[PDB]
Design a binder for this molecule. Sequence first.
Ligand SMILES: CCCCCCCCCCCCCCCC(=O)O
Ligand SMILES: CCCCCCCCCCCCCCCC(=O)O
Ligand SMILES: CCCCCCCCCCCCCCCC(=O)O
Ligand SMILES: CCCCCCCCCCCCCCCC(=O)O
Ligand SMILES: CCCCCCCCCCCCCCCC(=O)O
Ligand SMILES: CCCCCCCCCCCCCCCC(=O)O
Ligand SMILES: CCCCCCCCCCCCCCCC(=O)O
Ligand SMILES: CCCCCCCCCCCCCCCC(=O)O
Ligand SMILES: CCCCCCCCCCCCCCCC(=O)O
Ligand SMILES: CCCCCCCCCCCCCCCC(=O)O
Ligand SMILES: CCCCCCCCCCCCCCCC(=O)O
Ligand SMILES: CCCCCCCCCCCCCCCC(=O)O
Ligand SMILES: CCCCCCCCCCCCCCCC(=O)O
Ligand SMILES: CCCCCCCCCCCCCCCC(=O)O
Ligand SMILES: [Ca+2]
Ligand SMILES: [Ca+2]
Ligand SMILES: [Ca+2]
Ligand SMILES: [Ca+2]
Ligand SMILES: [Ca+2]
Ligand SMILES: [Ca+2]
Ligand SMILES: [Ca+2]
Lengths: 536, 536, 114, 114, 75, 75
Amino acid sequence: SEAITHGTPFQKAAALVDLAEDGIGLPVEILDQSSFGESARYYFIFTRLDLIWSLNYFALLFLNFFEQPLWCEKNPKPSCKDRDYYYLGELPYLTNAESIIYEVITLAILLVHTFFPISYEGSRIFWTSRLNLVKVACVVILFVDVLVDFLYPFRIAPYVRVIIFILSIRELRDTLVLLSGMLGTYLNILALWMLFLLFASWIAFVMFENTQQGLTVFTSYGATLYQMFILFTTSNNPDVWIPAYKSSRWSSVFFVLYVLIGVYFVTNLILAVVYDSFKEQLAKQVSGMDQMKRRMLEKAFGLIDSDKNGEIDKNQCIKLFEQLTNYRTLPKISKEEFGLIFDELDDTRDFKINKDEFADLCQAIALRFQKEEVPSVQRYRAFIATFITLIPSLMPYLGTIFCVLCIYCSIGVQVFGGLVNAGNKKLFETELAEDDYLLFNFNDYPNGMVTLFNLLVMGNWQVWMESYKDLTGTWWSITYFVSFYVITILLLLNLVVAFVLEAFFTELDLEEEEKCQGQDSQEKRNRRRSAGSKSR
Amino acid sequence: SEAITHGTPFQKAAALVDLAEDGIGLPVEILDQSSFGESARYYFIFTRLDLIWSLNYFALLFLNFFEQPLWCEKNPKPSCKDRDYYYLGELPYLTNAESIIYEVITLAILLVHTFFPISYEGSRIFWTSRLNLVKVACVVILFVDVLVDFLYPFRIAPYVRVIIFILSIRELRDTLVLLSGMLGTYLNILALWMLFLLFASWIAFVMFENTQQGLTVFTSYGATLYQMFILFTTSNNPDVWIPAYKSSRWSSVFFVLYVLIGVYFVTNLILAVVYDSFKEQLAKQVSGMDQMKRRMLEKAFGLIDSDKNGEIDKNQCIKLFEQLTNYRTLPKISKEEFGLIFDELDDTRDFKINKDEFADLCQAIALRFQKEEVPSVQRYRAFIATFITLIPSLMPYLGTIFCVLCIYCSIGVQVFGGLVNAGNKKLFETELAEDDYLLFNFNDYPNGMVTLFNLLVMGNWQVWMESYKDLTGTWWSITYFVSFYVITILLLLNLVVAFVLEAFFTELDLEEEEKCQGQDSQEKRNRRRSAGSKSR
Amino acid sequence: VQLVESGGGLVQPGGSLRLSCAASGFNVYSYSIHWVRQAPGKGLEWVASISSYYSSTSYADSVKGRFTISADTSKNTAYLQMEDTAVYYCARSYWYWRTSTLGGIDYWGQGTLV
Amino acid sequence: VQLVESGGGLVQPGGSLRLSCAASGFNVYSYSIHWVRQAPGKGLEWVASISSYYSSTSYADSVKGRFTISADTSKNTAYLQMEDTAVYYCARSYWYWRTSTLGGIDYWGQGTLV
Amino acid sequence: MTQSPTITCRASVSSAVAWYQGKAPKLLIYSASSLYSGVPSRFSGSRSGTDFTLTISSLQYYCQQSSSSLITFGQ
Amino acid sequence: MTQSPTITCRASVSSAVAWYQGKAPKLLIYSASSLYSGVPSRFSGSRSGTDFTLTISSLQYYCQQSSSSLITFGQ
Ligand SMILES: CCCCCCCCCCCCCCCC(=O)O
Ligand SMILES: CCCCCCCCCCCCCCCC(=O)O
Ligand SMILES: CCCCCCCCCCCCCCCC(=O)O
Ligand SMILES: CCCCCCCCCCCCCCCC(=O)O
Ligand SMILES: CCCCCCCCCCCCCCCC(=O)O
Ligand SMILES: CCCCCCCCCCCCCCCC(=O)O
Ligand SMILES: CCCCCCCCCCCCCCCC(=O)O
Ligand SMILES: CCCCCCCCCCCCCCCC(=O)O
Ligand SMILES: CCCCCCCCCCCCCCCC(=O)O
Ligand SMILES: CCCCCCCCCCCCCCCC(=O)O
Ligand SMILES: CCCCCCCCCCCCCCCC(=O)O
Ligand SMILES: CCCCCCCCCCCCCCCC(=O)O
Ligand SMILES: CCCCCCCCCCCCCCCC(=O)O
Ligand SMILES: CCCCCCCCCCCCCCCC(=O)O
Ligand SMILES: [Ca+2]
Ligand SMILES: [Ca+2]
Ligand SMILES: [Ca+2]
Ligand SMILES: [Ca+2]
Ligand SMILES: [Ca+2]
Ligand SMILES: [Ca+2]
Ligand SMILES: [Ca+2]
């Protein structure tokens, strides 16, 4: 009945489907778990003890992570009158006796999560992995920090809780491989974006310096790089250049051409670059994933050959399809499949399957039949074919950004911390007080989690920027709000825009070539699929 | 010396030197000009009398077109105190004795543009073309309107001057074929865009209607479709949803998820559709552009042979490379170029006798040699390879939009005319007065030409909308500013964004495959070119 | 050199046939094919054209979408997938676009009885 | 069935040769090839590996980028574009990734003198 | 595309005419000014505006017209 | 990847070792516990942690180690 475990007896028909199943839905098995001889040893029991109890290890990652919005602020410990709300949020503030019966529960499920692959890897296979060393160090930070939070700097707790949460969820760690493979491309095009604003702020400083613009707004040079940075964004738009328009109308031609170039050539040719390094790094990851299917389909091939020769037998191919449990009449298909496979050895009549012949065979049966059964609109189609495809296909590319906004929140809670007060005086003349953004705040973790959303959408994004440059005094508060721009209009153009383009082009070729799937051939060929992938 | 003038009869091998030339740089001769048998009659002298004097016919189009910003306003004729400037522009106003020595001079060089191909078409070939029946009717409008403006509704002069200027410049008429082929695709995705706002304004009607949001802003379902339309745009962003946020913090989750979906799925999957129907309509135009020069290479072939059987001899090939006046020696071409033909007949030991042999032969020469000569950074390369490519490659896709903003200006000068006055009272409480826009106006033609630029960039685009809905009183002024949005979310996502992506992928292709072909072979291959363009 | 039609068997209503237009005087790419028929007693009627040059396979008004044309350059054959009681002929215009005037349709086939 | 190396002629310094590793016991995609050499008096040295299965053609540290490997599956031949005074051998491990234990390298070539 | 029983045709103003004649049609005149070879010249042609003067002279017929790819006989 | 002159090798702890032996190398013990065929059993293998016990018994050597694709003999 139950086909969940099946690795402890693990026969040549029984352990065959234990790995031939794991090439279908692409699961992971450790290459250390595979490099052992039997693949049924003391190690294999203790990976199905992971991925069966794998909901106590992933819903912990939120119980870990969402303790950040339910923390305190960093700093009402110096200040006076906390309980009077100085523009704060609404979530409660967990007391220190409530952060100890919730950081031990969270850290009883990390020294069970991270010290679990000592039960399927060695005392030295473990500690030489460059990731597994990290997640032991992240926990010893949280184990020191629980020790510090028991008996009494800037408290790097809530940055580790993001970083554990990135490394723990597989797809966010896998997404972050793209962003570190894309980064050398992006810092070039960032370094030519910057040369666009550096040059165009120099002419804008040169041209208007005597007249009524460059006395009013364009005062120095640095407060023109600053203004022409925000015109790049478009969000500053006539309010930059009104007093150079009121005094001569002709000088809009500088400014109606700068934001024409800045938004329609350069921003698209940041999008086109970051599209282009998304195409290359993604297929570099698929070929880093497809080669892991073939790790299994050389471990699938190499359990069968008890003779250890190099090929498998046609009757042995059929008689092992009984454990496959896909179709009733077994031998009436494999003779048809040899013509369905583009190649065949034909050194013998029947017993001839080369290892790459099998490598595409077991990736064909699972896609045509699709019958395992573990007992345990036309006008608007191509849009909602994609729009339904995308909702779990952006959850690793919109969970990275939520873990960029959970880094910047914790920075922003600490750099810009308790400042927008109803006791404050430099507040009440900024743009936060007149536009009335006096929540959207940074005085807390979910006051400032939402503030970064508004900054992410770019709706009036410089109201917050020009306020915190005035509430903190320095020009250095600018650099928090320019860093968010650069990193996350990489992220909101890379993994969010350029994905939704290429995910539309896949639910457009599964609708156009779907007509060819019922007209050109009723059964699936292998060379037409390889030719259609490079063609679009 | 000069080989341009040859309507005076060239030789049978020397009349080739034009039609083989006119496939290289892609000019066009009329299919009625090729319709006559000789192709050297009076119908050919009088096309080279066009494209030689073709600067008196294209710089007239701007002398025609830019009389719009140099007009008057439509309506200071009723009103009082014109010369006191009620926020008007800067240009002068041509008086009626200055619009008659400039509309006759414009209409002396426009009939001679329109009634010129009667010197190479008939009294019935001409009048059955409909990009020709129109341009006679457009002039009879301007000839009636000059007659009306000599001896004394809503004055449809300045809309015709755009429409002539579209039909007259070839690439703007050619671009507008895409937009009329793309339009049936776009009105579907527009009709699913509205269903996003119609649905999401209904839950936003429903959810908030009792509480403090839906008594302040979200009052009725008109003013939530209206508000949630502007949140789609992002430009309204926290100011819509502050008094829902101030009363419960949880109602950001409706609004931080609506603008998450509205901008990152839907706006990209309007961009993905409009980039999908740009790929199809452009190659549908290139394959309509190939036959404009492939018809030449059946008129090239069809003068070489004497008896019209379908052949060229080898010496008959070689006798014409000397007519090219490009390469030095005779026998080293066809001994090399026949091997460069991928599919040569080799029926004789010398000649290759088909018409599609020659159809790619006379196109491969124009790429490898490029030796006609009529006497008459690595890190930042792929960006400025495209950025220099794109400046004349968007001038037909940014000249359509300038002729959409020259339609809306003339509408907007007339629908929203001399209304923002310093005598007005309902002006001074709108958002134009408090933001001080109060210029960016719609009173002159270049007051409102710039205003549509700010609306196009979407920098504070609803200040003009929400202020003109209060100056005209209606809700119908909304529809001017929603229709500008829709057409230039076709136009600013089709013709500008989707082009700058695929123009980057071609100056990606001329950098990636330049390295590949430099190591693959010594000379140009024709089958790698046919496969590489069919990939991206 | 001159034309050979083939595929003209004995057709029933409902189903149809598939023609072929064989040739030996380089009669695709250069000298392209036209299918013109004649019902008995009637005049001629044009039923299908083709360019193996331009890659355009276009055909008439009253048969538009009914009758499908294709080619084979390697054996110089123009196929044709099919009150059609007719007598089919092939044809070799030198021109393709306006073959009325200057090409004509030079060489006509031998005849068939469909 | 067993291995044949070829391409081992008489090489000059500067230029190089191009090897070949012939086989008749279905010895690409399944039983993949390894180039291991031995300079005279020395021990062995691994110089090139390949998968016709995984499509990975990877090779050593001290020869990294110097020596290029390719294949011909249709004739089961593994080419190899080239003080390299050495004696080249071929090899047939069944496993590719960690062939150190579970393949060995089963069949060694006949020998050459490069 | 209408004949007339000295033979004329109808309706592409001057170069839209081939003029033909048990038998398959033999071509006679392309363009109604150019006798096709191998045939005596007792059959001549002339384009007269919107009429095509195909011509009988001596004593001892399917005119043609296209524009782009669609071709119109007579009968 | 260091031999020791009963022979041992060095250093990929238990399933990264085969042991070989005028002649081309003949394989002897793949896995360092699995006698390859055709061979008398006077040569046996044993993995002892970070040591690889290749074994001489009877009287009448190029151990091997990879991790992913790069392979390390002895000498
Ligand atoms: C790309 C993702 C952007 C994410 C933006 C974060 C939105 C989450 C905001 C949560 C606010 C929670 C406050 C609730 C108060 C309460 O119910 O008591
Ligand atoms: C493409 C590079 C050219 C732009 C370089 C701009 C040169 C500086 C701008 C002119 C003023 C100098 C800076 C003023 C601020 C200061 O020095 O105190
Ligand atoms: C990545 C774009 C650049 C980010 C914006 C840079 C802001 C530079 C402004 C700092 C200089 C201050 C202006 C000079 C006048 C002064 O403060 O005394
Ligand atoms: C690391 C990224 C840097 C991007 C731009 C950095 C800008 C540094 C300073 C720019 C303007 C210089 C200030 C001029 C006026 C002044 O303060 O004297
Ligand atoms: C990427 C995860 C961790 C990275 C974030 C490290 C913190 C960067 C900024 C430090 C926060 C404190 C700011 C220093 C200035 C100040 O305290 O006023
Ligand atoms: C995910 C990476 C995020 C790390 C980058 C964030 C830190 C950059 C700037 C933080 C604040 C710097 C300026 C401090 C303002 C102040 O001192 O008042
Ligand atoms: C790529 C993003 C980098 C962030 C941009 C730089 C951060 C702002 C730099 C401006 C600081 C100018 C110096 C003024 C210092 C002061 O007045 O106290
Ligand atoms: C996509 C193109 C957008 C086009 C926006 C139009 C910009 C042109 C504005 C011209 C203003 C000219 C004012 C004349 C003043 C003077 O007399 O000197
Ligand atoms: C997906 C479609 C659902 C949206 C349609 C719901 C209609 C709006 C909710 C009730 C308001 C009706 C509109 C106002 C009419 C009135 O004046 O009463
Ligand atoms: C397709 C997007 C919508 C286009 C513009 C949104 C239309 C909203 C129009 C509001 C109608 C009037 C408001 C109803 C309440 C009232 O005035 O009585
Ligand atoms: C032609 C495109 C139409 C786009 C959307 C038009 C919707 C018109 C109606 C707006 C909603 C109802 C108007 C007022 C509602 C109310 O009175 O409660
Ligand atoms: C596309 C070129 C011409 C199309 C433009 C036609 C004009 C559409 C709107 C008419 C302008 C007058 C508006 C009528 C309402 C009013 O006068 O108040
Ligand atoms: C290029 C096409 C443009 C044509 C579309 C523009 C006309 C749509 C609306 C024009 C004004 C309509 C509302 C009038 C306002 C009012 O009457 O006060
Ligand atoms: C796609 C662009 C369509 C334009 C959107 C609709 C513009 C019309 C205004 C909406 C209906 C408002 C009805 C209220 C009438 C009134 O009170 O005078
Ligand atoms: Ca076997
Ligand atoms: Ca077979
Ligand atoms: Ca804005
Ligand atoms: Ca904006
Ligand atoms: Ca000839
Ligand atoms: Ca030849
Ligand atoms: Ca304001």
